[PDB]
User: Which sequence fits this backbone?
């Protein structure tokens, strides 16, 4: 076990595994990746249960801090941004403002408990359950859509503000609905969930967005803002260099 | 309708806290609990989704998910925090920042990470599973035994991870204190289950009560509705919850306030 660096226990499919890799990369941390293979029982295998009681990906070992283990992608990101800010004095992907950090946590916990889990069941009942049961598939498909509605309405709100301050010349127009914000030349430019800066709250959704297509959800069509917002993230070098393996 | 909710936002205080909850809401009691343990004075407003109080304009903007619990930290320009996981963390950052003492938290980066590990575990794998078992076992448009069975299996699996974890904390506690019997306990001569400190409280993180432990209290008192008999199959969890459920602040939180 190395005494400097990080080790990330993941799995080829694991979306929360790519989520950690992403943040790990955006922050310039050097990490090793070990893909546990559950089709042999290495996830519940004791050497790892010590690192993660939940016996599953994703898990992180902070070699710097006496090989400390952090399971649960949500906690891993808060540990990573905290350590990064403590080290440089620069809150990259985070915020040195308590009010912003709570809003960031709000969206982070909202993603980990109300997005990934709903997408998870939506998949189960649609692909792995022991029988086709529509009422159950539609339950998560509907819930997952509602959550994208929440995210989408928030981003359109942040956008409205931007497109309405860098173009106060036609604000009332882009506000009354008379004319779509699609026509403002200040559209394209990226907006985020909190702090008008990229943070882990925005990143936490990406690995899960690339997959709600196999659940029948077409973000491109039914969630415009969520679409741009994802496209802005996928286009990041660090993310590109991360997503895959 | 929701004029009351729109009224409240026209008379917010400049200090104190307001907690939007619901009689059933377990994460509502979870915030009340931590709010109480930290000595914070709060007002509680039970939204009745029946009159669409959650659809009120003022509520949704201060809380995008339009669900409960939601905490307004009036002292901080009515800063609104809508996730239960985010309400706990905020509360502890403030208490530590103010008093300079990490009650229910920690001032060591390593410990905080362990705390947040469990915190995310409960809010993301524990509460949501229990919710699905409750749904298929009681409110879903048709009975799907396969569904009910799976979600009751998962809470039991999750409860197993917290059990084996507290079981480790106990083995470590009974071996540290009660040194007049450590040799045996390890040798195998004595069961160790008969140590004087066997019913003593063990905590998930740092040998102290944290928000990682309390988060489970509300959900622990609910799993009896899906068959889980904690006292039997999850003894360690049993003592742990009992210890917590016996604290004056927690019982104050419980019996509504």
Assistant:
């Amino acid at each position: 076990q190395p005494l400097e660096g990080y080790t990330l226990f993941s799995h080829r499919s694991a979306p929360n595994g790519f989520k950690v890799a992403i943040v790990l990369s955006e922050l310039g941390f050097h990490y090793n990746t070990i893909f546990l293979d559950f089709n042999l029982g290495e996830h519940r295998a004791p050497e790892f249960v010590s690192v993660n009681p939940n016996a599953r990906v994703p898990a992180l070992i902070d070699h710097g801090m006496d090989n400390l283990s952090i399971w649960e992608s949500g906690a891993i990101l808060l540990h990573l941004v905290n350590k990064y800010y403590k080290e440089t004095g620069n809150p990259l992907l985070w915020s040195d403002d308590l009010a912003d950090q709570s809003q960031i946590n709000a969206w982070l916990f909202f993603q980990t408990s109300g997005h990934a889990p709903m997408i998870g069941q939506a998949l189960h009942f649609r692909y792995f359950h022991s029988q086709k049961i529509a009422s159950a598939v539609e339950r998560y498909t509907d819930e997952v859509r509602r959550v994208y509605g929440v995210v989408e309405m928030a981003l359109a709100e942040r956008r409205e503000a931007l497109v309405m301050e860098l173009d106060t010349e036609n604000a009332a127009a882009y506000s009354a609905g008379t004319t779509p914000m699609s026509q403002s030349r200040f559209f394209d430019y990226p907006v985020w969930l909190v702090g008008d800066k990229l943070t882990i709250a925005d990143l936490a959704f990406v690995p899960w967005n690339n997959v709600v297509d196999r659940i029948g959800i077409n973000i491109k069509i039914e969630f415009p803002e969520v679409y741009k917002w994802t496209k802005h993230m996928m286009r990041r070098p660090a993310v590109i260099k991360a997503l895959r393996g």
In short: Chain A touches chain B through 46 residues (CB under 8 Å). Residues 134-163 of chain A form the longest helix (30 residues). The CA atoms of residues 231 and 244 of chain A lie 17 Å apart.
